[PDB]
Amino acid sequence: HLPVPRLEGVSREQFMQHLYPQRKPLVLEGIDLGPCTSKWTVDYLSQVGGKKEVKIHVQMDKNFVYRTLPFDQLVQRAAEKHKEFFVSEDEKYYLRSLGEDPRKDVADIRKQFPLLKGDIKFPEFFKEEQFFSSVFRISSPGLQLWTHYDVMDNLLIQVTGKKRVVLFSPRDAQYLYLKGTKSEVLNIDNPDLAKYPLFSKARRYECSLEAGDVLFIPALWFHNVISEEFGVGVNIFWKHLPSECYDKTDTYGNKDPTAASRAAQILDRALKTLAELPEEYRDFYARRMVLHIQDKAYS
Amino acid sequence: QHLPVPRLEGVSREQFMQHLYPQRKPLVLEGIDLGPCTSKWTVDYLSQVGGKKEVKIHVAAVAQMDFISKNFVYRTLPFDQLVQRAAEEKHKEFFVSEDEKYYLRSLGEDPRKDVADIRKQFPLLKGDIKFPEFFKEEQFFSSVFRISSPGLQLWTHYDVMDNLLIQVTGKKRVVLFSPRDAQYLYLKGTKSEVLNIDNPDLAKYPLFSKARRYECSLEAGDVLFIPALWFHNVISEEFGVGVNIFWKHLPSECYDKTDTYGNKDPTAASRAAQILDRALKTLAELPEEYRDFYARRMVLHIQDKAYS
Ligand SMILES: O=C(O)CCC(=O)C(=O)O
Ligand code: NI
Ligand code: NI
């Protein structure tokens, strides 16, 4: 239960030249985000944001179904056991902003919530060219989000309400039972070691974003976010690598850099060759392979 | 773990070939009619009937031969003379030290083109020995003389062929490791860095600890079956003469035609490594924080789609 460092009065420069390079999670207390942290009450937020349709999600596994609703009702229901309901009386809601055409364009609080945007100052921790996306994350009290990872550097700004989040090192990948970018273990707290023995060797870092706190999540770091109370956050993705290194298709910040994806493909070719020797020689030379990859491309 | 390699007597060409062989495990066979070699081949006889065919030889100043440091030097001798020296302890004449040890491993006339064959190169001697007929004729790949000074310790290597190591004279301690144990052995090519296997430097080679070793000793008359890929480490305990017979377990097509020894890995496997070295080249131009993550993705993938 390692804790992630909290730090006050950290500077633009201090961050970029001395903290950022450490490549480790870190929360930043007392940054100036503007008025937003002060005036984004459920009652204000509904008014300002508007009634544009936002794609909704309704401990989550598919035990959730997607819906849609007017932004203003999304928030108001997020706060509320909601009276009117898509599925249940004790429904829980969850927003994750997306562009107009989700497969074409990234989310961006500027373009999509202009009026609300003017209320928040994103930390100037990266260069304006490196920007990737800005995302509203509004969830209801208690919601539990599977443990995923993102390929962009991330700033998770907690604007309103509390929120627990626990993180894992990229190197605790093996113990994570990775189905793509998500991990199989839903309940982080008391995990059925029965079903997944390895999840226990994973060193977890924990921390709790209080309204106004900023959590930095380096590229590749694993993280579970549980909304202690109701609240709205925004996180900001940005390109750590030269812009050419990433996936063009990717408007979520989830697809590996092409390089990873390319070498992962030729890897499947090497295996298609190997596969034609009797299992026993195939086994042998596969292990001889991972031996190689470890000596040379590890740390 | 320290296991024993089974020792079976009166095993027949059919049992071995049908029952024992497909098990793919080490096995020693006792009491096989090896021909008269086993009683005839004294050092005096071998010098004589073996002749003066000049042979390439390993000379070493220390029992524990080493490829990392390469603490031994290639030389040549007339066969008879090699035998004669291998059987002494001290030496009148010598390449390096009065106490130096010798190792013969029979080679073809032109190693670049010719596999070694006891038949072709020591015609008179092949007369005294009846190779166990335990494989199909067509798959016979090679047959090698092995002659060593007492107390000489070769290194842990594996071979790509199946192999019958025939212990004609002297006594040989042989410990083997599974091919799955590759991860514990600190290999560099078909060789292992761990030289001292009885008193291993665990400070230097920690993983060597997880390695489960089969052990067995070879006495005159004993024949040992060493399936391909099985690591093995031999130590002639007193001066002895072995011969060994490699042969193809796979479609002859699968092997590397340029290989006259039995080391070079099946072309396909070799292929996959040139391919893989390509992936490891493209990925390599990602920052290491990243590349490292995708390496570990890669091995996770191999242990699933490609391991046993
Ligand atoms: O007998 C020896 O000295 C070594 C034999 C060996 O390594 C083999 O037959 O593969
Ligand atoms: Ni995320
Ligand atoms: Ni060998």
Side-chain angles (χ1 to χ4, degrees), chain A residues 23 149 170 219 240-241 256 259-260 263 266 268 270 273-274 281-285 287-292 298-299, chain B residues 179-180 183 249 265-266 272-273 275 277 279 282 286-287 289-290 292-294 296-298 301 306-308:
Chain A
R23 249 52 256 279
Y149 84 79
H240 168 48
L241 310 183
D256 319 319
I266 117 166
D268 260 335
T273 70
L274 228 291
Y281 291 71
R282 202 193 73 231
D283 180 282
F284 181 73
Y285 281 107
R287 334 187 77 109
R288 196 207 57 177
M289 281 174 132
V290 340
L291 227 309
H292 191 223
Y298 267 38
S299 168
Chain B
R180 309 216 181 162
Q183 353 139 334
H249 162 70
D265 300 291
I275 288 190
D277 244 357
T282 100
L286 243 48
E289 186 201 12
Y290 284 71
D292 177 288
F293 183 68
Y294 288 124
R296 322 184 106 85
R297 168 111 129 193
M298 284 183 181
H301 187 208
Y307 273 29
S308 70

Side-chain angles (χ1 to χ4, degrees), chain A residues 1-12 14-46 48-50 56-59 63 65-66 68 70-72 74-75 78-79 86-88 91 94-99 102 105-108 110 112 114 116-127 129-161 163-175 177-178 180-181 183 185-187 189 191 193-194 196-198 200 202 204-205 207-227 230-238 240-243 245-247 249-254 256-261 263-268 270-271 273-278 281-299:
Chain A
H1 209 310
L2 296 166
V4 359
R6 321 174 65 94
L7 312 181
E8 14 163 45
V10 24
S11 62
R12 196 195 180 252
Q14 178 192 199
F15 174 83
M16 295 175 352
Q17 294 173 0
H18 318 286
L19 292 157
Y20 188 73
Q22 276 190 173
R23 249 52 256 279
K24 288 215 314 168
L26 254 39
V27 14
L28 304 194
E29 267 166 307
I31 292 185
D32 185 38
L33 303 171
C36 64
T37 195
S38 190
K39 70 173 179 179
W40 281 359
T41 55
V42 45
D43 231 357
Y44 175 80
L45 213 40
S46 60
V48 216
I56 305 189
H57 298 73
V58 174
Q59 180 151 349
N63 74 351
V65 334
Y66 301 4
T68 64
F71 168 80
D72 70 282
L74 180 28
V75 219
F86 273 75
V87 150
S88 171
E91 247 190 295
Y94 178 98
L95 169 48
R96 188 270 190 222
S97 277
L98 281 145
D105 36 80
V106 306
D108 192 327
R110 314 189 182 104
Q112 316 176 183
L116 285 184
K117 210 302 186 168
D119 300 3
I120 183 166
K121 325 181 165 162
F122 296 158
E124 300 177 79
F125 285 171
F126 47 78
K127 307 178 200 171
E129 36 210 320
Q130 324 180 211
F131 172 86
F132 181 69
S133 174
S134 74
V135 170
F136 265 109
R137 306 269 187 162
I138 295 167
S139 72
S140 298
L143 240 184
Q144 244 220 223
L145 271 269
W146 51 92
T147 295
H148 56 283
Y149 84 79
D150 306 87
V151 52
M152 319 290 316
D153 280 317
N154 188 8
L155 255 12
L156 208 213
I157 303 179
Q158 190 55 353
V159 178
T160 289
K163 184 179 297 179
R164 176 160 73 52
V165 357
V166 29
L167 287 89
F168 298 92
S169 175
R171 303 191 179 214
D172 296 0
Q174 33 217 186
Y175 318 103
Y177 300 74
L178 254 18
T181 64
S183 167
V185 190
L186 282 315
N187 103 289
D189 287 354
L193 207 282
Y196 336 78
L198 292 152
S200 15
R204 86 163 178 179
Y205 297 48
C207 95
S208 288
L209 280 60
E210 281 281 17
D213 286 342
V214 168
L215 174 84
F216 166 64
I217 317 168
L220 267 18
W221 281 67
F222 293 96
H223 56 279
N224 183 115
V225 341
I226 299 182
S227 193
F230 161 79
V232 17
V234 335
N235 83 295
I236 299 174
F237 289 114
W238 85 86
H240 168 48
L241 310 183
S243 337
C245 279
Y246 299 86
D247 205 12
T249 348
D250 194 25
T251 62
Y252 207 90
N254 249 261
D256 319 319
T258 56
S261 178
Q265 289 201 293
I266 117 166
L267 197 255
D268 260 335
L271 294 183
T273 70
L274 228 291
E276 65 199 34
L277 290 47
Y281 291 71
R282 202 193 73 231
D283 180 282
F284 181 73
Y285 281 107
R287 334 187 77 109
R288 196 207 57 177
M289 281 174 132
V290 340
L291 227 309
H292 191 223
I293 297 166
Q294 290 172 133
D295 181 70
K296 288 195 172 186
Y298 267 38
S299 168

Side-chain angles (χ1 to χ4, degrees), chain B residues 2-67:
Chain B
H2 185 220
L3 317 209
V5 185
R7 300 175 67 92
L8 284 164
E9 188 189 5
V11 179
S12 80
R13 168 180 196 261
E14 5 303 322
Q15 347 209 244
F16 175 83
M17 261 192 316
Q18 286 307 307
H19 205 60
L20 296 163
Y21 181 60
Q23 224 75 199
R24 264 37 232 353
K25 297 256 161 182
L27 145 59
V28 359
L29 312 186
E30 310 200 291
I32 279 158
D33 181 10
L34 263 10
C37 45
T38 207
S39 72
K40 290 175 141 234
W41 287 10
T42 72
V43 0
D44 230 52
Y45 181 100
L46 284 179
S47 320
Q48 196 183 299
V49 184
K52 294 184 182 155
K53 180 156 199 150
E54 186 161 60
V55 287
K56 190 180 183 188
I57 241 148
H58 292 64
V59 173
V62 281
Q64 213 156 62
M65 288 191 43
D66 187 335
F67 79 79

Side-chain angles (χ1 to χ4, degrees), chain B residues 103 146 148 154 157 159 163 165 172 226 232 234 244 246:
Chain B
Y103 187 53
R146 303 281 185 151
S148 37
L154 198 25
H157 65 264
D159 281 291
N163 178 32
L165 176 52
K172 235 168 220 173
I226 304 189
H232 52 274
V234 340
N244 94 245
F246 287 129

